[model samples]
Target: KVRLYQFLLELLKNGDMRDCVWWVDREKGTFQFSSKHKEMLAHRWGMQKGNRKKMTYQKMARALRNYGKTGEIRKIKKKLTYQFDGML
Candidate 1:
């Protein structure tokens, strides 16, 4: 199955996510994306999914929410921040 966290890690390793506002706190198992590039971020995520259609931030956020049900990731009230359970 596809994992958003793994996908994000790849982006981070390649430095593509950093060009935008993607930030990670490895020490705390936290990550964040800026609201300004929400659309861009979702667009890229769709690409990762190999979908011909399109992916919006809303859809991506929903995916995250679904993934959250497993207690692997938790959303923070702060703009676009998230806390990862096993990222450490």
Candidate 2:
């Protein structure tokens, strides 16, 4: 098991840093991602969830959005990169 917030921050700090997800607005806590390397990230999330076979970016993103309801994320319905306060 891994911490989602910390993992994502690491990605923003030193991940492929791009290609998979992009900083649409790094300063404003907003960003976006493309289809590129979607599975790779999803794979990590799947493993963390202990079910890589069915874990997907879409599924993980939904959880992120659900977290957004608690201010754990933002732009829930937007094409955001699941930005949060820890990232800012």
Candidate 3:
């Protein structure tokens, strides 16, 4: 299975699934998360630092090991399949 954190990092970087505040403030510039978006807000905040040098190698190793064990990067592949119609 794909590592949850790694997938989140890439999603954030690409802006496919942006921080909830960004979505909320797309027009009026109000960068605040509504109660319904609180859970995702917390998750995005946690992933904000996922690319730091100290954690990068460990995250990569964990993701690779998990991929090897399962032979499927489910989380990442699920999004890819949806976005690209399995072309990826």
Candidate closest to the true structure, highest lDDT: 1
- TM-score top scorer: 1
RMSD of each: 2.2, 2.6, 12.7
Model 2 lDDT per residue over 1-88, tens place: 5666666656766755477776666786666766767767767767766873777777767767666544756653665455666546
The 10 consecutive residues of candidate 2 with the worst lDDT sum are 72-81
User: Residues 1-86, candidate 3, lDDT per residue (tens digit)?
Assistant: 44453454355346653433232222321222234544554454346545443443334335534544234332233211111112
TM agreement with the true structure for every prediction: 0.77, 0.71, 0.25
**Cα-based lDDT at residue 20, candidate 1:** 49
What is the model-wide C-alpha lDDT for candidate 1? 0.73
Prediction 3 global C-alpha lDDT: 0.37
lDDT of each: 0.73, 0.65, 0.37
Models sorted by TM-score, best on top? 1, 2, 3
